[PDB]
Every structure is written in C-alpha cells, then in structure tokens.
Amino acid sequence: SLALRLVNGGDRCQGRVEVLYRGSWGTVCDDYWDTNDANVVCRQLGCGWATSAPGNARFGQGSGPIVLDDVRCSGHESYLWSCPHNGWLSHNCGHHEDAGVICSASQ
C-alpha cells in the first residue's frame, strides 16, 4: 500500500519519482539525489539498474505534497522510503526540484 511509480517519462521505467503516502501521490526533492537513490527505485520497480538520476524536474513538476527529501540510500535498501532521509513530509524544496530516474529497462 506504500507504492512508487514514475510519471511523465514515456515508459514506466523512467519518469518523475512519486510515492503514495496516506492517499496522495507526492514527489521527492533532488537535494542529495544520486544514482544510488535511483538504483533503489529502479530495483524496487523491477526496471533493473539506474542509468541516471536527473534533478530539476526533468520529467516536469508534481502537484502533490513533497513527501521525501535528502535521500541518502546506501544502495542495498528494498524501498526508497527505507533509505535515510529527513523524514516523511519534511523538506525544504519546491516542485521545480522534483527528482526523477531513468532505468535500464527504459527503451
């Protein structure tokens, strides 16, 4: 029921990262967003390994809440929200900072 998808990306394996928290799809700030974070996302979606982790709303801007920020994944986590971060709904971003991924399974 805590879910994740990629949107405005062209296939399911690349897009803006969004997370279903408490009935709402919300976004992820790009502040420490790297390919370790994007691997956790790609692995958790079954899209494999990450080819990049673009910041600056490269797949546009969400209009939900911003649900995660300062994500600092070791790389071995199952789910993005199990990584270290500043806690649910704690962020210092706007949606222009929304984080995205491209995965291997993207065409």
From Swiss-Prot:
Residues 4-104 form the SRCR domain. It is found in: Secreted. Highly N- and O-glycosylated. The O-glycans are heavily sulfated. Induction: Up-regulated in intestinal epithelial cells in response to pro-inflammatory stimuli including TNF and bacterial lipopolysaccharides (LPS). Disulfide bonds join 29-93, 42-103, 73-83. The SRCR domains mediate binding to bacteria. The minimal bacterial-binding site is an 11-residue repeat of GRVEVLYRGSW where VEVL and W are critical residues. Interacts with LGALS3. Binds SFTPD and SPAR in a calcium-dependent manner. (Microbial infection) Interacts with HIV-1 glycoprotein 120. Belongs to the DMBT1 family. May be considered as a candidate tumor suppressor gene for brain, lung, esophageal, gastric, and colorectal cancers. May play roles in mucosal defense system, cellular immune defense and epithelial differentiation. May play a role as an opsonin receptor for SFTPD and SPAR in macrophage tissues throughout the body, including epithelial cells lining the gastrointestinal tract. May play a role in liver regeneration. May be an important factor in fate decision and differentiation of transit-amplifying ductular (oval) cells within the hepatic lineage. It is linked to Glioma: Gliomas are benign or malignant central nervous system neoplasms derived from glial cells. They comprise astrocytomas and glioblastoma multiforme that are derived from astrocytes, oligodendrogliomas derived from oligodendrocytes and ependymomas derived from ependymocytes. This is Scavenger receptor cysteine-rich domain-containing protein DMBT1. It comes from Homo sapiens. The gene is DMBT1. The chain holds residues 1248 to 1354 of 2413 of the full protein.
